[PDB]
Symmetry: C4
Subunit: 300 residues, 4 copies
């Protein structure tokens, strides 16, 4: 259920901007205030104008789109939305750039707390290069938070190069076990699976070509942090004050943290909570795991 | 049949320049006025001096040649042709540079509406790198428009490295199915096959080495554009005012658009016509496909 | 046995700094005075503040850490340690940078006599790129001097990508024969094996996954130098005045050089001693080899 | 037989410089006057001080060495040799740099007529990268002129990585058929084999490891030029005035050009003679080939 403050931030984008929106919906994590957020694939501007309010004036939203005309349209509405939001200065910059070349875009290393994306981004050929660029621009303790399509089996290249597959936007889908490998080699913590929904294939020829392989739309959090010291298992208590998730914080599909409850967490979950922006939101004292997005999706 | 205005632009290059022309003939698309056109392999200057007239003074022609002496000769004749054409300032720039390194040449991203080439360019070892540079320098809705040699079968490397093959300028030829793969991975729309002529092999040793493989000279349009929104199937009417193609526009080997006729077109053809410079030339309302250049050439 | 001057340099780092130390211990070569030393993975600052004293004010220590907060903490204590050491100006610089990109860090080519590392560095995926950057920043005759984990057999990628393996910090371990290959292709002399200790595997799933493969922690010196001329076999005499190794210099596991003794050495060892900073420490006149770290550790 | 002017240029290097020479001997092409010559692996300076005289003051010698101390020694003697040679200013520059990174060395594209090397250069792991840098810094019509070790058979990787092989400086040797492949892909004309001498192996273990494979030391000219137009087969007459090769010019092992004789040459040889600096030395009118260095060496 879309928390109210997000619903209302949506209602407050200029209707022209919202009219021009191509996408799958906001894929957006929790606790956004004061953050620097990079929006991969900013399009005509809607998500960034949502985030502008959600991070407030101490925060910043950078949007990057490969289409100069989109960037021009988005920038048309900067002053409108900065006025409507009562902001003395703009907290949103739009860049024309290619997402696998964030450096050429001008985005510095460790400059953003969070990276989110429009689902058009799942239609690169090269996912690894995107993850490397996201990792480079992410601050310590920041997260890549994003939805994409994965496959149940490792498809042969000849099937991934197939015109039918690319016709259904299932081009570039990773075998799901591949995501963790990429994170391991790039420097991310293991992917936190949050949610997963099976994709039904209406296409008859595609039904033939893929075989027993299935497809899933799934959301993962990828955290960037460093091991400054030994970590023990820890207990955490959610203090209950993240906007729109006061009562409980569904962090991933293994951990829902209900306000005030004492939860024991593994070394990595604890490192993530300690090193991220969530640390302000938990009391952390020292002293059945789903990963497979198809089992997750099957169990609804 | 060479449209008159092209014939006459040819007649108007300084006879010295035209004398020094090594090539296969003008491979040149329609509707050139006001465009920025990059000529890969400008040689001594003829094609660029043709294009200078065809785009007019609001337009620009950049030529790039790997041979400094060619560039010097071409530039010798800038003022001659700018006078003859009645242009206030020059609309052509000549660059000494290698075509797989257009960045080092100084050509910016999204700076040219069209990229064409001299057939010497089909004699790179690395076609993909050339296509990546053409994609990068091309504006949104622009086209790479070019002729090259393709093969009917995937030749082994031991045959593509053969000195006989390279002796007939058939070195670097792609297996024709490869072109679409490269476009898919680089960011181009699917190649529009325009025309195709089988190459006869007079060489007896080559007859031996290639076997049942055949070779074709074929022209493709590769468009660069982005998916800002859903596209439906559309109808288009050609308004009939492209210089030299008033009565009808042969866009590719699947679509000839006769003036005033209502043609239903697929989602991609419509995206190309909507996003390119051809949009000015069509009324577009929302409402048997040859790809194989050897089938195309056989049917003449 | 830790030479006294190192022990005392350790005792003289601010207790806060030393408190924050994650690592395997100082892996540090001999004859450090006046040198420029790069510390890969400087952490919160301890090793660099040790080296600051060991190289003295004519020398320099650069530390590089991928974690900006570590760099900030380390730099908090620059003035404390420069005062305590009686140094007119600082001889340590701390950089926030990633070790496989020393160029972007700002470290010039041939700017450092020695490169050492924290064992967290053995947890890169890409060892070769690290070695290329160490070769580039190293002066002629300088050394990469470092400890890491190697394997007795070439593990498949199936197994190196395994979450158990990476869980024990044995991710990224090279098959030991690979080290010399990398040095050959990068420009290093052959690795000098110094010491080696077998790693015991307490993990029961890992016991199953690796099979008959074993793991070793081993220290190698990799020297960078160029062949300006023919080299003969040579004799060398250690003059006996390297701080903390007066009596004898254990150079590697094939050569311990006792003060005053005349030792015949091969062309390669002689080139290294001639072209390095050890040349000041030997008289060099022109006239059974262990390489395998598992044989070394077994003995 | 070493032409006198080379012998005398050697005698005129400061004996200190000549004392410090590690190498295989001058590998140096003909007609050097006024040229820009890059010396890969300049060492302590001897070859460059030879070339300084051979090109004269209108020419230039750049030497590049990976060892800063060598560069310092070489530069110690600049003024000595510039005085002795009666030159108004220095015509040699010494650079500390790595030969596979001539760009970082500061050597511009198309800046040198000729590239020669010290045989230590044959001890890179990466020959192709060296050839790419030599192609890039070479002017149109210039030549890479160099001696190296090649093998009669394609050795497996495990044997090329062998510490015995690398112990005899036979590390990095190419299979001889590989040289032409690299030239084809880089942009060089086919290698001109000039001379070849078999290497005898007096190592017992190496005798075991390589098997039936043999090794040869061989000299090739690699020319860089572009195809500005059709080339016919041609006749050439050597005008007989190249210093030290007045009576005849042994160009390669297929062509010795005796003064005044009329020789018919193939399209490629003619392009090379037309586009190089040798053109001044021939009258060129438009009107049994050894390649295998082991057959060449066997026939002495």
């Amino acid at each position: 259920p879309v928390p109210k403050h997000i619903r209302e931030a949506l209602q407050n984008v200029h209707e022209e901007v919202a009219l021009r929106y191509y996408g799958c919906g906001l894929v957006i994590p929790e606790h956004l205030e004061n953050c620097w957020i990079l929006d991969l694939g900013s399009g005509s501007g809607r998500d960034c104008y949502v985030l502008s309010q959600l991070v407030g004036e101490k925060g910043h939203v950078t949007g990057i789109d490969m289409t100069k005309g989109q960037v021009e349209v988005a920038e048309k509405y900067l002053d409108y939305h900065m006025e409507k939001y009562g902001f003395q200065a703009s907290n949103v910059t739009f860049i024309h750039g290619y997402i696998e070349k964030l450096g050429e875009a001008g985005i510095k290393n460790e400059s953003h707390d969070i990276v989110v994306s429009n689902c058009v981004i799942n239609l690169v050929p090269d996912k690894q290069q995107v993850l490397q660029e996201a990792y480079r621009v992410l601050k310590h303790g920041g997260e890549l938070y994003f939805s994409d399509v994965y496959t149940s089996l490792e498809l042969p290249e000849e099937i991934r190069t197939h015109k039918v597959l690319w016709g259904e936007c299932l081009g570039g889908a990773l075998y799901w076990k591949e995501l963790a490998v990429l994170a391991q080699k790039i420097g991310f913590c293991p992917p936190r699976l949050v949610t997963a929904n099976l994709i039904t294939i209406q296409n008859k020829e595609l039904e033939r070509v893929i075989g027993d392989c299935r497809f899933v739309s799934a959301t993962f959090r990828l955290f960037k942090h460093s091991k400054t010291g030994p970590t023990k298992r820890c207990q955490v208590i959610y203090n209950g004050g993240i906007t729109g998730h006061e009562k409980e914080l569904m962090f991933d599909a293994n951990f829902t943290f209900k306000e005030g409850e004492i939860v024991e967490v593994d070394e990595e979950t604890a490192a993530i909570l300690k090193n991220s922006r969530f640390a302000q939101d938990f009391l952390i004292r020292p002293i059945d795991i789903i990963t497979d997005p198809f089992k997750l999706a099957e169990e609804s």
